[PDB]
Amino acid sequence: PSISDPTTLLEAERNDPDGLGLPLKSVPEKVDAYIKKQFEIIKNLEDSVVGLNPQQFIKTDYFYRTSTIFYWIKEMARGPNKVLLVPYLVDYVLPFLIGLVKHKDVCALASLDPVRLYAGLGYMPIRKNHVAAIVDYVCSSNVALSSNQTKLQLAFIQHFLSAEL
Amino acid sequence: MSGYDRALSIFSPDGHIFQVEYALEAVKRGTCAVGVKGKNCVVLGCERRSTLKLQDTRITPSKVSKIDSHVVLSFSGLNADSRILIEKARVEAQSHRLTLEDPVTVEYLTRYVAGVQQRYTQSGGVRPFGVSTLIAGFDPRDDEPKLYQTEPSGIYSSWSAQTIGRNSKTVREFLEKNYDRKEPPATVEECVKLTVRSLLEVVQTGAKNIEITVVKPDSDIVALSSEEINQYVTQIEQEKQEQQEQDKK
Amino acid sequence: TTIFSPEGRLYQVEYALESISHAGTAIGIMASDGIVLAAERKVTSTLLEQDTSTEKLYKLNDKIAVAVAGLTADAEILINTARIHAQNYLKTYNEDIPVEILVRRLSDIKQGYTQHGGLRPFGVSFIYAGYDDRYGYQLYTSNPSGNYTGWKAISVGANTSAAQTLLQMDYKDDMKVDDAIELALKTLSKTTDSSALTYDRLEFATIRKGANDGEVYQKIFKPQEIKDILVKTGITKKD
Amino acid sequence: MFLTRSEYDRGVSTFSPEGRLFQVEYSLEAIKLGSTAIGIATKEGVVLGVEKRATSPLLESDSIEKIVEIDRHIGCAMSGLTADARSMIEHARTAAVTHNLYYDEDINVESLTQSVCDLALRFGEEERLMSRPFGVALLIAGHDADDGYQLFHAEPSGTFYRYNAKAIGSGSEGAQAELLNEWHSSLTLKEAELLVLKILKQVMEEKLDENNAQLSCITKQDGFKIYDNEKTAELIKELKEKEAAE
Amino acid sequence: VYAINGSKKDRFFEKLVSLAKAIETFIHPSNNGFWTKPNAKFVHAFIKSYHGRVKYEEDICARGVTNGICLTSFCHEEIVEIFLNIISLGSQNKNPDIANYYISCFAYLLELDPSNAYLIYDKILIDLYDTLADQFINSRHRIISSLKQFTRVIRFIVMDKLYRV
Amino acid sequence: MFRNNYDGDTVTFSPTGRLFQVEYALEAIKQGSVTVGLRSNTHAVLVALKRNADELSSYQKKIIKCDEHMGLSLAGLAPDARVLSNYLRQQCNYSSLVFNRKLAVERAGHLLCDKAQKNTQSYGGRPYGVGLLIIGYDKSGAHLLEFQPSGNVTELYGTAIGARSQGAKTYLERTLDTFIKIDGNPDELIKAGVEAISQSLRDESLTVDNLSIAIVGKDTPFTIYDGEAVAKYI
């Protein structure tokens, strides 16, 4: 956060009336937009995989992007970076991970594990602000989910509710 | 059977976390062993750990072991166990001919090996072998290269290229890019070159650490010497300099 | 109880390897014309019979010798099995046993005592030595695991690491047996826990050729012969 | 979540206060964790099929064939392959040939199924009792002159049922529900093929094709055959136009 | 322990009944695992610390006045009602040093002199008569834990005119 | 909360002389479907309800034949009911080859007791998890034996084994004189069992596939009924 003054840090943390302060760490706005642009590139590239089998899906730019963003999320979800990931959960990261789960043979040809990753994201340090948005996202019924995605959403709501007792 | 799948918390049955899983851990810690087929050969290659300065090279065992005039075995995991596992396979093959007027088939040398490994898994407070193997060769009166992998549990499978031991992910990744199953290496030289490129990415230092055996039809078994694999390593390193200097900028 | 540690490693073999890591030091060196074996013997007993004919060093046949680190009770079971196999090979083939065939024979028995849970492994490390026509002078080591390896010079038992470093810097491929006498005595004097080396603390042997073309000879040295190589070498605990 | 452990769990050769053997019962729960296998018996043939996991291109297919010939009139589907699965199948092979050379005729499928269950009661090779499990679920399918087209679920317990249709591996509940809602004694062989493909489509998550699915049938005339990828493809094309025709 | 306002207690005790309900299953004697030592020591430290608070503020009350942040009889009653089942389940554990943490809680609960104290004495008489009448002869933990429980409370059973008989 | 120290091994005794593993082996009988056994002076009968695991699944076998003169039903463990029934058929054949009689069913009882008591006394096994009703006819008339897997047996006019059998048992006990006299009209001895077993069906119903009937008395040897053979008995 590199705040200019100790008193500016103190005022900024006292400004939220709930007595929980600001996040300890935060992404600067150009870095934030770079992170979001990688997911929007993936969302525009979805048209390039609509017809094809896993063996050539593994040879697409869409998959190379997706496999990189999987390794980025998976490394961000360890150690001191989990807080950097909670701002991207309901808009980009969770939508991306349920997206990957449709491609179960791609997750077998490349040794990816969207299931273990997404279920494990229920245990991250999520703020009171983000709990309500996480709850409205997981409580959104879309008929577009297959059983694997809806039972993954229940698995999340299992490791989330138990981690929100 | 592992990780985050857990109903009403969880409790363990008789199941997964078991002696055979710890034998699989021993296999992964043993040196890298690779095999690739070709149009009309099969090459097995191994990692030596870089020999100590006081070690005696002329009597040091060739890591790839001949089981019979047409069958070759290499391993990762426990050396002592592989020595006990090669002895059983060698006498099993010599006994095959003595009782069947037929040299042992590569598929019977793989079902037997994995078969004996499975019996030391099954029961008795006798431990499974900390060993995984490549078994390669030709059947008699045939020109088709064969290559099998066996695992401590006694499971076995056929591969057109495979790798076992240390760092084998990175090697299998390179093989999936460089080995085309429609057009495999059409000549022994290219098959050997592919195994030297494959091993060069994972070995400790260089030509010291690689060693290869080439199997061909009609019992033409042939270990390559240090000097022969030094000219392969040097040719591959020449092509790296050539590719880098053929940068266009 | 012969079960794997979760890393795929055998607890009993590791504990047998801890046991031999206390068990007295032995050096072997392979010259261009013979093999030297030497072993350091913790004589903390005055009334123990020094000038007993063996403890650390043993004959396996007319051209093979061993040094022992580990339990001597365990070693003597393997040593007899190796002696029986050497004579059973000589009886079958009319020819003296090749060193590789015998060293690995004792490495196959010692692996079996590590797999079956009714058996404890053997707490012994062997530095084999010998001659045959197939290779020439050969120096091998074998340990409680059933692993075996070929060497030009090696130490086993206590103080292995200091000894390997001292061997490595002074060993030459073209040295003679008398240079290996000197080297093995120097190495042990530069490695010993006892204040200085002397003829009763030391077990010694050689595998030379002699003057006569058909000979290979295995002098397992009596104490008075060891006193002569001590006073010639400059270790020389002499009046 | 809340913990629900008993003191009788993990008992080997022991009864709970109800009589429950918990090693063989916890082994019977593995019929949800395997790759999907389905069998459909009819008056015309027993259609067996398994979902393939997509392999490395270097692993050659004959290493992982989860539909297998026991004999010209008998075959196994497995939801998961182990050394013990090949042990059951090679015991079944050796049992079927030793029957044919001793009794001069082909083995009854019930008697083969019982002989693989007797291997499971022995725990391989003292009173043979049902205390501990062995191997994996087999769907054994076959045809004989006395009891016709038969599908057996052979379990790790050394017991079995004949089924008209059975699913094993990770589609078990939704598949068996659709099978029991849909099966007829009027199923033709063609309709048994489209039915197994419609069931496979619904569990597999992926778009069904000739590279993620495998078919076979036992027929009395043709014997056991695993189907050609071109044949499953023209069947899958036929499923597409059958639902588009609604 | 030092959060509780003895005159506004209801929302604090509402979080403590729901904490105890969450952990109640992790106490039960067939559910051993990494959480056993955490739970046994939490239950002991909470009850010891609450008794240390009660006896600290009872000493201020004895020579002065009562603030109304001080705990009331109703709070010692509520504490027995929350923790009585927890101490019953945890005292039957397979590890005898784990069982001793819960058995040690009974003395603190009796030393509060709650209106509920009959619940603790009644339980310890039932089990102690059931052991000495050999009703638990197959269950050596019931024999030993009931002798351990009775030993902890003899000094309180001795003072009450009914249970002293 | 109430751990039992003395139920791990078949060889342990409780401090009160119980063999808890053996009493748990009896609780396995309560895991099966109901079977009813009953006898007159000249016939013994078994009627058995058979379960399935799903509507696509063939119903479980419940009545087994050892010889022309006796056989059994099994409400307990099916794969363990194949061990005892194999041994009983082996003993019937041994009697015809080695003694040239056929094994009188009291003698069959003594041999099952011996085999089950051996399992109950030695380390490295388990009690049998199955109760048998054996029915037979020989020179001493119509006979019915309840084998219980503790290694015991009893001569009985009738009994029921399996889940919810106290109902059928209480109907036989309230209707005993009714079935003990019947003799030369064996179909009413079958309808007596079908009323008894019907009391254990809690608005479940008998069906042509759900039920099997077996009878052995006088000349008519041991026979089993299935499908329409049991439709005239619904």
PDB file of C-alpha atoms in Angstrom, chain B residues 19-23 25-27 29 52-61 78-81 83-84 87 90 120 124-130, chain C residues 2-10 30 104 107-108 111 114-117 135 137 139-140 145-153 164 167-168 171:
ATOM      1  CA  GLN B  19       2.378 -49.536   0.991  1.00  0.00           C
ATOM      2  CA  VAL B  20       2.054 -49.413  -2.813  1.00  0.00           C
ATOM      3  CA  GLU B  21       1.741 -45.606  -2.774  1.00  0.00           C
ATOM      4  CA  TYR B  22       4.999 -45.385  -0.860  1.00  0.00           C
ATOM      5  CA  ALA B  23       6.655 -47.737  -3.372  1.00  0.00           C
ATOM      6  CA  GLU B  25       7.297 -42.533  -4.102  1.00  0.00           C
ATOM      7  CA  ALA B  26      10.573 -44.565  -4.121  1.00  0.00           C
ATOM      8  CA  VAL B  27      10.324 -45.042  -7.946  1.00  0.00           C
ATOM      9  CA  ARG B  29      13.239 -40.574  -6.605  1.00  0.00           C
ATOM     10  CA  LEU B  52      32.278 -39.916  -8.299  1.00  0.00           C
ATOM     11  CA  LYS B  53      35.984 -39.261  -8.997  1.00  0.00           C
ATOM     12  CA  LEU B  54      37.089 -42.495  -7.211  1.00  0.00           C
ATOM     13  CA  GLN B  55      34.369 -44.694  -8.800  1.00  0.00           C
ATOM     14  CA  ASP B  56      35.453 -47.497 -11.211  1.00  0.00           C
ATOM     15  CA  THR B  57      33.820 -47.054 -14.625  1.00  0.00           C
ATOM     16  CA  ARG B  58      34.948 -50.225 -16.544  1.00  0.00           C
ATOM     17  CA  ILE B  59      33.065 -52.578 -14.129  1.00  0.00           C
ATOM     18  CA  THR B  60      30.062 -50.238 -13.462  1.00  0.00           C
ATOM     19  CA  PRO B  61      26.792 -51.947 -14.539  1.00  0.00           C
ATOM     20  CA  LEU B  78      15.574 -49.096  -5.971  1.00  0.00           C
ATOM     21  CA  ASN B  79      18.659 -50.657  -7.662  1.00  0.00           C
ATOM     22  CA  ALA B  80      18.925 -53.654  -5.268  1.00  0.00           C
ATOM     23  CA  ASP B  81      15.249 -54.491  -6.064  1.00  0.00           C
ATOM     24  CA  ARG B  83      18.738 -56.547  -9.584  1.00  0.00           C
ATOM     25  CA  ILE B  84      16.388 -59.102  -7.860  1.00  0.00           C
ATOM     26  CA  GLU B  87      17.301 -62.148 -12.205  1.00  0.00           C
ATOM     27  CA  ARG B  90      16.262 -63.577 -17.074  1.00  0.00           C
ATOM     28  CA  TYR B 120       4.699 -58.716  -3.248  1.00  0.00           C
ATOM     29  CA  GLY B 124       2.123 -60.956   3.865  1.00  0.00           C
ATOM     30  CA  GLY B 125       4.217 -58.179   5.397  1.00  0.00           C
ATOM     31  CA  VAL B 126       6.574 -58.700   2.467  1.00  0.00           C
ATOM     32  CA  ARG B 127       6.890 -55.214   0.911  1.00  0.00           C
ATOM     33  CA  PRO B 128       6.283 -54.357  -2.776  1.00  0.00           C
ATOM     34  CA  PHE B 129       9.324 -53.511  -4.909  1.00  0.00           C
ATOM     35  CA  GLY B 130      10.296 -49.800  -4.986  1.00  0.00           C
TER      36      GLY B 130
ATOM     37  CA  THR C   2       9.934 -53.843   6.451  1.00  0.00           C
ATOM     38  CA  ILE C   3       7.337 -51.202   5.556  1.00  0.00           C
ATOM     39  CA  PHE C   4       8.031 -48.017   3.581  1.00  0.00           C
ATOM     40  CA  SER C   5       8.265 -44.534   5.066  1.00  0.00           C
ATOM     41  CA  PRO C   6       5.799 -42.226   3.159  1.00  0.00           C
ATOM     42  CA  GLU C   7       8.739 -40.931   1.052  1.00  0.00           C
ATOM     43  CA  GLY C   8       9.294 -44.494  -0.331  1.00  0.00           C
ATOM     44  CA  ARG C   9      12.291 -45.286   1.927  1.00  0.00           C
ATOM     45  CA  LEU C  10      12.891 -48.198   4.356  1.00  0.00           C
ATOM     46  CA  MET C  30      43.292 -50.581  -6.084  1.00  0.00           C
ATOM     47  CA  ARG C 104      26.675 -59.282  -5.978  1.00  0.00           C
ATOM     48  CA  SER C 107      24.250 -58.209  -2.225  1.00  0.00           C
ATOM     49  CA  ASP C 108      21.235 -60.418  -3.267  1.00  0.00           C
ATOM     50  CA  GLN C 111      18.388 -57.366  -0.041  1.00  0.00           C
ATOM     51  CA  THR C 114      15.189 -56.126   3.911  1.00  0.00           C
ATOM     52  CA  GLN C 115      11.943 -57.205   2.123  1.00  0.00           C
ATOM     53  CA  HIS C 116      10.397 -59.895   4.418  1.00  0.00           C
ATOM     54  CA  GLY C 117       9.041 -58.576   7.728  1.00  0.00           C
ATOM     55  CA  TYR C 135      38.699 -57.826 -15.313  1.00  0.00           C
ATOM     56  CA  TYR C 137      42.316 -56.264  -9.758  1.00  0.00           C
ATOM     57  CA  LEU C 139      37.612 -53.230  -5.572  1.00  0.00           C
ATOM     58  CA  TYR C 140      33.868 -53.276  -4.659  1.00  0.00           C
ATOM     59  CA  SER C 145      20.533 -52.154   1.550  1.00  0.00           C
ATOM     60  CA  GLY C 146      21.967 -54.702  -0.948  1.00  0.00           C
ATOM     61  CA  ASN C 147      23.470 -51.877  -3.072  1.00  0.00           C
ATOM     62  CA  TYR C 148      26.945 -52.537  -4.515  1.00  0.00           C
ATOM     63  CA  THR C 149      29.399 -50.316  -6.419  1.00  0.00           C
ATOM     64  CA  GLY C 150      32.852 -50.499  -8.104  1.00  0.00           C
ATOM     65  CA  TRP C 151      35.663 -48.201  -6.829  1.00  0.00           C
ATOM     66  CA  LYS C 152      39.358 -47.317  -7.319  1.00  0.00           C
ATOM     67  CA  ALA C 153      39.578 -46.351  -3.638  1.00  0.00           C
ATOM     68  CA  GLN C 164      36.923 -40.155   0.834  1.00  0.00           C
ATOM     69  CA  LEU C 167      41.717 -40.575  -0.938  1.00  0.00           C
ATOM     70  CA  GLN C 168      40.456 -38.313  -3.748  1.00  0.00           C
ATOM     71  CA  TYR C 171      44.943 -41.249  -5.580  1.00  0.00           C
TER      72      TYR C 171
END
